[PDB]
Each structure stands twice: as structure tokens, then as C-alpha cells.
Design a protein around this ligand. Sequence first.
Ligand SMILES: [Zn+2]
Ligand SMILES: [Zn+2]
Ligand SMILES: [Zn+2]
Ligand SMILES: [Zn+2]
Lengths: 222, 222, 222, 222
Amino acid sequence: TADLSPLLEANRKWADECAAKDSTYFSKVAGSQAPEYLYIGCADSRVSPAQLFNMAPGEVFVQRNVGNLVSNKDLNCMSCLEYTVDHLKIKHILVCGHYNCGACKAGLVWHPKTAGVTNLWISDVREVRDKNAAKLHGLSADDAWDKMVELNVEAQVFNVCASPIVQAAWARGQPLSVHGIVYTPGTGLVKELIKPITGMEDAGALLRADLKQHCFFSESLA
Amino acid sequence: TADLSPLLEANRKWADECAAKDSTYFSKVAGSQAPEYLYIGCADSRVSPAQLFNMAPGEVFVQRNVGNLVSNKDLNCMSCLEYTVDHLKIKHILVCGHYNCGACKAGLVWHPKTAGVTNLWISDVREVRDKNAAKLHGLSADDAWDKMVELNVEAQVFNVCASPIVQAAWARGQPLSVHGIVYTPGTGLVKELIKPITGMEDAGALLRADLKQHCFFSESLA
Amino acid sequence: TADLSPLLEANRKWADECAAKDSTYFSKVAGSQAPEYLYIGCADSRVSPAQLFNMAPGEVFVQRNVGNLVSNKDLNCMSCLEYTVDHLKIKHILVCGHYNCGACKAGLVWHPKTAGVTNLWISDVREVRDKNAAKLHGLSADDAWDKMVELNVEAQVFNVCASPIVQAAWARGQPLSVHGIVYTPGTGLVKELIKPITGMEDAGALLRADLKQHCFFSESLA
Amino acid sequence: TADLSPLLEANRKWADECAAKDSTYFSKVAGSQAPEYLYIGCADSRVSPAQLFNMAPGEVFVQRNVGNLVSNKDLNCMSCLEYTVDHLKIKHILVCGHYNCGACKAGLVWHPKTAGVTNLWISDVREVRDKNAAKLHGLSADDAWDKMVELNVEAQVFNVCASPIVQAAWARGQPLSVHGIVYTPGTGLVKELIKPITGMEDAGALLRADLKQHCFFSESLA
Ligand SMILES: [Zn+2]
Ligand SMILES: [Zn+2]
Ligand SMILES: [Zn+2]
Ligand SMILES: [Zn+2]
């Protein structure tokens, strides 16, 4: 019962359906790729980018990790961002959270003495949490969970915008836009939490934290 | 223009159908997930695992990084592995490489002096190449590329097998299998490179590196 | 010339003396170590902990990195912390910053777009600065630098306190203290910035961030 | 007894002795540093660089970690190397192992199912180990341990030489030399395992592995 035959038969059928309808569906992407989109999202099994957006092969380059986290000192995620931006010249970066996310739950409730690598990994969710005690405390377990997801989404858009890669791209006039969205596993629909950000002006109007003070910090000293 | 209306409209259209076909498609995965698979794959825009295996929401938990790499020392990949194995209790790990992989070509032709984070990330790929330098010795460019891909899939499978998370599940008598697969962007077809590995003895029959030696080295001293 | 003879000659001279003073200086630490201290400090060439505390061989176990930084997600620092606490059974952790620290100045004046790995590594330093933006607001260059150093020492001490290794030793009733110190390259003098922390209650009295909140957040939901 | 008074009194006395003998000992390094040496070595409490070499403040910038490891995807160690080479323009890099090293022991004998971050961290020692089964198997526990230390030293010189930083420096004609040495805790003496390496020619003559094939790999393809 460790056998893959059923699973290989599903893939075979799918590939045949696809090319029967469009002969160059796969052929036209045999030898290179040029997607317009990068998507950064959760490793959760209910949130499948290509299928929920209906995008075909060669349309969306994807990073996927527990909690949809972005950090300058994570060479895994930073690699997806640098390769898309600097070598494929993508136009749009999608940063996506989901309701009912258990990486955000563990962030609310786990004691940091918890054994294992997952507890190390979701340290980033604790940091967003600890900054928003005023939006979180004394809500129902349910209302706190949905609000944790939204805040993290906002946290990770800022991280993408404040990243060295995306900062160098905007400095050399490359058009690049960043987007904060959220998915509902219960209904399969996407909602837009934050409108499009295409540079320092949009960022300055749409994000809670101050990206400009972040980038130019000694223009606030003496 | 970075307008999202077109993408959202495609998600609308997508959700309505899936539901009209089947009323409970989404609502039954409202409040939890219990997938049976973990997929570790490449970040490239042509290899979409839920799409290419035709899997419904909540069927396959996903890690996706430049080059489908697995190291004990990468907390991003290691948490995907710990969460599925230890808490979700999955049964099958899919380790997937792909033909035409730009990460594997970078591993053959870049000089380690190249700037930027992607050059750091693919060091694992240079190490597989060096240990196997002789196998890649007189091949045409295309032939070294296809070989690199396949050698990388075998290594990554040994890495999952040798990981502390996995050695631990085996010693506890957890049922958990590991499978080396490859994908062709040009055809949409999955091929199987290494048959199922369900414990230490399959790993002895199937892998070219010695998993027993790695696990029990110190016994071969006096 | 890269000849090593001069350096080796200085080690010869050094060893002979220490031994002539005291026959068993070296031979008694031939086959094990049991130090009582762990030092986490900066990599800068002026801050040499065994020298500046005048400690003999086997007295102080050392971590040294650009900016004396501590994150749950850095396996280099975290193993120094786990090995001493869990296996060597140490009693005191020294977390040491220094005046004139180029890492702390880089954290104030670099634009996150700057190339190279040192710019990634010091993100922890930008985050301490941002949370405390107001305290650093109208200071002269020298004054913001000295403040940055001191704020960084407090943060890093909270990081060691909040780590899973340390929370775990405390819950097991292990005696283990944590101490925030600073060093002046110009004088050779150590000053003490935060008094000893020996458990949860000292941490409540001594740190400006709330360690209890961080550990038990989820209790303040309904 | 968690009290630091005795320890602060030792530092005070030391600093006074030093400046009594030489008035500018500390003063001349109050406002910057310019060391000639970087040292990369073990966090072991018996191996204290500044004291074993008799170097004063401002002479040796130091990285220290469990096992004296160097990896392109360790931002901690890679930071020490990039800062010294590119901003301070050091001339000499010292890579140092020690006999009786317990990071190298754990590498010989631990089962990789072992819980904790230290076991993740010393994965690099397993990789050097697995490549040298022919130098290691059927030696006494003691003889295998000393040989593990020597090999690792060689492993980590190669890693320094093959690093992006040191590769870019040599390409722009910066003089920089790499040195493989070993210390004996039992006798306090240093020994030279590998003679000085100042570029690709020296590396090519003195190192077991092929640095040239490593850097220029497609000049061995067709
Ligand atoms: Zn999630
Ligand atoms: Zn690929
Ligand atoms: Zn410093
Ligand atoms: Zn050691």
C-alpha cells in the first residue's frame, strides 16, 4: 500500500487531458520559463496556488513554508525572491495568508519551551504577536486567530518591501508590485487585505509601519 | 497596471464550479487538515504539485525551494518535515526534481565567486556534483544537466532518509515511506527514479550511498 | 610573507612560562573540560574574553559573532547554548556588548539595499532600533551609537532568557543565571548593565520587555 | 553566589597592569581597529586564541563555534569572513582545530536520531567523516579521534579557500593567506598541519581536494 501506481495514473490522465485541449500547453514551456508572478504562501495542504488561481504551468513561481514567513536571514525564501526579481524580472509578488492557519495558532498559544524545530521556526509569528497585544488580548479564541492571520500577512508584505532585493529593484526603476491577500479554506475564495504597492509612495500610504524611516533612519537623527 | 480584479475573477469562477459540482468540496476542510502526503519540490513555475497530481484541497502538504534541497541545517524545510511526520502523522514523503532545472545548471556552470544569495543556497548542489565528478566527466552539456538532476534527486532522498525526524519515526515503528520522483516540464509527466523506501532494509537495497554506515559508523573502530 | 615562525615562537615562549610557573597548568585539562561560564560576545579584535577576564584554560566556553547576536533560528549560536547548558551543565551565561561597535553603527546608517552577507546578518540590529525608535530620536551621532549598543545588550539578554534551552533548564530546576555586560575598548574595563537574572521573577523585575507575557500570551484571550 | 564582583575585580586588575606597563595599550585602539589576522576556531573552553598566541587587543578578529566549522550557508561565520576581508582588508586567516575535541567525537559516534540543535549543527563533521571511512575504520577510539580532528581541519581550510569572499579577493589581487593549524589542550602548543596558501597555485599543491576543478568545473566537461 506504499505503492504510487494510482498516483502516477492520475498525473498521466491530467497531462493527456491538458494537451488534448491545447497542443502547446506543455511544449511551449519545455525549454525555459518566464512567469510574471512570484507567490509566497503557506505549506498547508488546503491552499494550492496554481489551482486556486487557475494558473497554468509557467505562470507562477512559488515559495511555500509553515506560516508564509519572509526573513532576510532565511536563505531558502530569500533565494526564491532574488531569482524571480533579478534573473526572471517578474512584475508581481503575491504574499498570501489563510484563515484556520495552525502556524498562527501555535504562535498564539505555545510555550516557547516546546521541543522541536517547528517551535524554533515560528518565532517570527511570536514577534508579530508581541507587538499587537492591544489588538489581540481579550478576544474569543476564534476572533484572535483570524486577527493573528491578518496581522502576519501585513508583517510579511512589509518584509518583502523592506528586503534588500526589492529595495535594489525599485532603485534601478524596475517595475515591481507587492500584494497582501488572504484565502478561506472553508469557502475557497481569495480576499484582498492590502491594495497594490508599486514603490515607496504606495508603501507610505498603505502600510501601518514606516518603511521610509526604516530605509532612511539617520534622516531622523541629528 | 497591477490591478488584481482579473485574478480574483478567475478565483470566483474556479470556486463556484468546484462547489456546483459538489456542495461540500470546500466546507468539509473548514476546520482541519489530514493529508496523507508531504511533497518536497522545486520552486520553478512549471511544476505545480496539487495541479499535476490532480489533488483536491487538503490532500498534499507542500515545501518548494530553488532546487528541491533538503539539509538538517535548514529550519524552513526541516519544519515542514517535522510538522507532517510528528503532528499530522503523514504516511508518504514525495521528493521531486525536474528536467530543465536552472538550479541544477547553475550548480554546473557558476563560479563560486558569483555575488548574491542564490549562489550561497546552491552550495549543496556543488557538493553532490563534486562527489560524483567522474559520472559527469565527458558528457555533452544536455547530458550533464539531465544527470545532475537525477543525482540531485537521489542525494535529497538520502537526506530525508538520514534526517533525525525520519530516523526517529522509524525507531518508534511509525509507518512512513520515501519516494524519489522526477517531472518533465515539456510533457507534464511524472517518472519514478527510486522505488518506495519504508525502513532501513529498503534503504540498504535502493540507495548507492551507505545509510547503515552513516547511522552506525562508530562500530567500525576497534 | 605569510611565514608563521614568529607566531609559533610566541606560543612556545607562552607555554613554557605558564608551565614553569605551574607544572600542571596544562596537563590537568588534557582529557576534559568543566567550565562554569558561557560567554556570548562580539567578534571585534579588541574584546578577548579569556584575556580580559584573566581566565586560565578550561574556565570559559565562547561564542563570538559580528554584533554579539542571539536568535532561536541561528544554529551556530544555539548549539553553543545547548551544549553548555544541557551537557556541560554550566551555571552562568555572560552576554557581552562593546562601545565603538561597528556592527551597531552599521545597524544605524546602512540602507537595507547594501549588498553582501553582513547586511543580512545585522537585520536583528535594525529590529531593536525600530522598536526603540523614539529613545534614539534626537541624539548626536556618538550618543545614538552608545545607546544602540546598550539597547542591543538588553535585547540579547531577553533572547537568551526566552530561548527554549533556557526556559527548559528553569522548568527542570537547573541553577542557571544570565548577566548583561558591556566593555570599553579604550580602557579595558567591563561594566555591568543588568543585574543577575536567575529565573522568571528576576526577569520580571529587571527587563523592560515582558518575559511573562511572551511565555504565557494565550491566557489573555477570553 | 550568582555574583560577578570577583570576576569584575580580575578584569579591573588586568586592565591596570596592562596600562601601567604601556600607556597606549588600550588608548590607541579606543576609536577603531585594524587587525591583520582573522582566526576561526572551536568554542571549547581550553582553546583561547588571544592568550595562546599572546596577541594584544586589535591584533586578531575571532569567530568561534562548536567544531570550528565553515559553510557558505552559515550567515554567522560568513559574516566574520566578509567583514574582515572586504572592509578591514586582513592579510592572514587562521583555521584552527584541537585534539580532544568533543564536537569531533560526537561526529564519530552519535546516531543522527539524537534530539537537539547540537546534533543538527555537527552534520558537517559527519560529511567529512563519511568521505574518509578508509582513514578511519579499525583504528583505536583514540587514534580515530586525533585523525578526525586533522581531517576536519583540512576540510575547513578548503571551505575558506573555496568561499565566495576569498575567491573574489584573489580575483582582484588582494594579498590574503590561509593557514591550517592544530592545538594540543594537554601541552598548550600549536602545530602547523598545512603550510601557507596564498592563491590557486599554493592551494593546488598543498590540499588533497581539487580547488581548481571546484571553481572551473565546465573546463572538465565537453
Ligand atoms: Zn498555515
Ligand atoms: Zn528547478
Ligand atoms: Zn562589535
Ligand atoms: Zn572542540
